[PDB]
Design a protein around this ligand. Sequence first.
Ligand SMILES: CC(C)CCC[C@@H](C)[C@H]1CC[C@H]2[C@@H]3CC=C4C[C@@H](O)CC[C@]4(C)[C@H]3CC[C@]12C
Ligand SMILES: CCCCCCCCCCCCCCCC
Ligand SMILES: CCCCCCCCCCCCCCCC
Ligand SMILES: CCCCCCCCCCCCCCCC
Ligand SMILES: CCCCCCCCCCCCCCCC
Ligand SMILES: [Cl-]
Length: 533
Amino acid sequence: FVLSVAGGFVGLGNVWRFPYLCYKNGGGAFLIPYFIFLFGSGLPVFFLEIIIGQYTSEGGITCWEKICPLFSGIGYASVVIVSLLNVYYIVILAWATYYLFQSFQKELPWAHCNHSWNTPHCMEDTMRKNKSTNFTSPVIEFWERNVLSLSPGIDHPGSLKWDLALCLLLVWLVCFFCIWKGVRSTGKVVYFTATFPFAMLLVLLVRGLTLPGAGAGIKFYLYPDITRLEDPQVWIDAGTQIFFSYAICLGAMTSLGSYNKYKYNSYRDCMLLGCLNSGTSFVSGFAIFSILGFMAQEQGVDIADVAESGPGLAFIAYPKAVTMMPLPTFWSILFFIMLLLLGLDSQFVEVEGQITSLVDLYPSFLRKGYRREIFIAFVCSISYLLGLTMVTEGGMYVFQLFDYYAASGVCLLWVAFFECFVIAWIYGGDNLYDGIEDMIGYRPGPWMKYSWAVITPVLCVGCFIFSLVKYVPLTYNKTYVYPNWAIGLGWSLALSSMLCVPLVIVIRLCQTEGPFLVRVKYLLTPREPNRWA
Ligand SMILES: CC(C)CCC[C@@H](C)[C@H]1CC[C@H]2[C@@H]3CC=C4C[C@@H](O)CC[C@]4(C)[C@H]3CC[C@]12C
Ligand SMILES: CCCCCCCCCCCCCCCC
Ligand SMILES: CCCCCCCCCCCCCCCC
Ligand SMILES: CCCCCCCCCCCCCCCC
Ligand SMILES: CCCCCCCCCCCCCCCC
Ligand SMILES: [Cl-]
């Protein structure tokens, strides 16, 4: 149906990122700011970007020049954000490829621990209750000592891991020869593409719900502990997860909406897609936390200490689940194929959009003087060389710093706040409503206007100031304290995109003649936003 063509309601942000962020922040208290942000700023900004693209019929950069020439740095900020995100979004795919290649033997490597990479502290999970120190689980030991080979800190990069580097090269070469060729989909594969992840998720959920101790996991996942709400990090993580999953503030939704017709009702579509995305994110937590509760019951420890409080939660939990099913290798192969399929489509779309946006800036020297293939190869090679920094023995710390500052946090709240503020208080909410009534056929209600003028601005500014007043530095797995220069580099990563609006404002102000007031009054006037008809 239209849902099959719509897709996007499933992604790695729903399967890999939401459960680990919910588990890190206690679980249950994460859901109040999550839903508050979802119904206060998530859907309205998505609809605003879609409608701006549809109205202007322009991409992510040229659309802001026809609405407010002064505030034209939002497109450059989005370009920088997407460029930073494309570097580290593919290490997850590299890990999935490594796991898939490792799951082709007669026995799964993480089922038992008697191998070369194990330690004397390891014991089988089913025999821990017989005896009881510092004992460890075979699956965690596998993930930490065979795939990662963790070092004592970020300042100990150790040596490059050649198998992970080759997997990264393989996934980047898959991205190439497909972005270049242009093969995206057909009229027969989309039925299997959009149905396989849901079938796998249903199988995993059914398996998890029947395990002993699942009720404790559900209670942990659903009970809203209140005293955790005084920490700004819960609010920031819950708010930025919605932005990350919806792929807003990246310049992609504007381009997607630019392909719609002028007379098309996208309001109902933006609501359906958002609701389905949120529901898909919410459902898989049940399976994840039922598995976690079963593991806690089996090992005789707390649910808050069984697994990693970081990005490896899925790679620790899901293989444990597939080890409890008949024919485990078949299910492992299916699960990791599904993960790769989920990741590759988003990576393809994002890299293609970034390349198109970068080419559009210089159409003369990137279409005639230089071919597009050379530019694509250069971008891919630079991204691979940059991402080589996260496949060493101390690359997990570098990955955690880019997933906290590069494409989330204060940098995603800055862009959203400036978009909403510009639209609400310069162009005009009533003017935008008149346009929307012209296109979609009927006038919307007052929810979108108030979310653009009051709710989104207050939430963004309030969360930012709260974090600075009660400051707490970033940690890894609750125990690693990063050095000061690492925090400085992480903040520079966000500032590199945050500093795009004032600089463009200064350039525009200096590139005009006349009095200051005259200059400001001229760069604030929209320039024929809808020219078609
Ligand atoms: C005003 C427009 C039309 C033309 C001028 C565009 C200029 C002002 C914009 C476009 C892209 C922007 C740059 C994008 C990336 C970086 C890298 C960061 O480390 C320093 C800021 C810096 C250097 C930005 C500063 C301003 C910038 C150069
Ligand atoms: C450290 C992050 C770097 C991210 C780089 C993204 C692209 C930056 C260049 C964008 C276009 C600049 C030229 C625009 C001239 C009008
Ligand atoms: C024992 C488990 C298997 C470990 C070996 C990993 C294989 C890595 C695959 C990538 C090799 C291809 C290089 C790039 C293609 C030209
Ligand atoms: C004693 C050796 C120090 C090891 C630190 C190296 C860590 C790598 C961090 C660099 C990441 C690049 C960010 C800026 C480029 C976009
Ligand atoms: C009438 C003058 C309005 C000028 C608004 C300037 C806002 C500058 C940024 C304020 C803080 C935004 C934080 C968003 C979340 C990081
Ligand atoms: Cl989500």
